[PDB]
Structure 1
Amino acid sequence: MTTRFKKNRKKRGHVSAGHGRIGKHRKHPGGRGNAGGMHHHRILFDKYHPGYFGKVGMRYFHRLSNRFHCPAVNVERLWSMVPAEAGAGAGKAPVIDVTQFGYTKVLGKGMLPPERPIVVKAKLISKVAEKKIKAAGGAVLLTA
């Protein structure tokens, strides 16, 4: 059988949720909210990839710790940081380095696995209760 509307099956993806069954994710409300306005984005990278690219990250200066072991501001290591509201460091998988990471947010089990002598650094915007008191100073970076 065919007319491809008698064996086909059917026309548009319905009889499928209501009364026949399988498939979509189906039957909805449910949360909805926030709008298209006050919305995303928070950029997030786990500290094991900065540890990939410590040795090859030779645009980030080494300093008080040995030459492998670098201060690096993570805001200027995260692709698509500039259209994001803040850059956060996530805590998965090891760090075997003596780094100094600068972030706009850090996890609590994000400092803790690279406790292994570190200085974990808030940027001014991490607070974010820090004084843009008309004044002058600090800023967010911009690039494509």
Structure 2
Amino acid sequence: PTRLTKTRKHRGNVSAGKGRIGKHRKHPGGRGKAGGQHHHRTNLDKYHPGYFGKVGMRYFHKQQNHFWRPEINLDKLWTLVDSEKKDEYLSKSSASAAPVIDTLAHGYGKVLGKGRLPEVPVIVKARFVSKLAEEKIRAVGGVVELVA
């Protein structure tokens, strides 16, 4: 609200806080990103290195949907098990009856390997998997099943 601004406190003081010498003027220094290579180089080279120039190759008509692959780590993987049967699955799961985890149906593209699993067999369904993620899944007695 206007009653809380410093404009109200500057009333009666000549320069409105902008100085007598400098004198708030229209556009000293130019408009926008003007002078980025000339008189604003000391700002851009300090706070935005990399600004000027070209790196890498172009990609005409890039479709971002081709690259959709949300990641889930092993330390989070049991959140996908139904919450009402998680406690039971942790106790009763064996090599002959293990929980199935359909990661793609939960909206994930790749299973990554950060963290530690419960020492319980699981069946993990995924489009992609990292080398360590599968190795940790097989070490608790589980398996990764590739789906498309």
TM-score (norm 2): 0.60
1:40–1:28 Cα change, 3 Å: farther
Structure number, greater radius of gyration: 2
Query: How far did residue 53 of structure 1 move?
Result: 4.2
Superposed CA offset, 1:39-96 (max 9, x none): 522222212212244361759xx58628xx5211111122xx5xxxxx2111111112
Which residue matches 2:131?
Answer: 108
Letter of the aligned partner of 2:104 in structure 1?
A: V
Aligned-partner Cα distance in 2 for 1:57–1:90: 25
- Check the 8 A contact 2:110/2:127 in 1, yes or no: yes
Counterpart mapping for 1:46-125 below 5 A: 46-54=73-81, 56=83, 58=85, 65=94, 70-78=99-107, 87-96=109-118, 97-114=120-137, 115-123=139-147, 125=148
**Percentage identity across paired residues of the two chains:** 10
- Check the 8 A contact 2:101/2:124 in 1, yes or no: yes
Aligned residues: 111
SS at match of 1:49: helix
Task: Find out whether 1:5 has 2:32 as its counterpart.
Answer: no
Aligned-partner Cα distance in 1 for 2:84–2:128: 21
Query: How far did residue 29 of structure 1 move?
Result: 0.7
Aligned-partner Cα distance in 2 for 1:14–1:65: 67
1:53–1:103 Cα change, 3 Å: closer
- Structure with bigger helix share is 2
Letter of the aligned partner of 2:53 in structure 1?
A: H
- Check the 8 A contact 2:80/2:101 in 1, yes or no: no
Higher relative contact order (CA 8 A, sep 6+): 1
Aligned-partner Cα distance in 1 for 2:105–2:84: 11
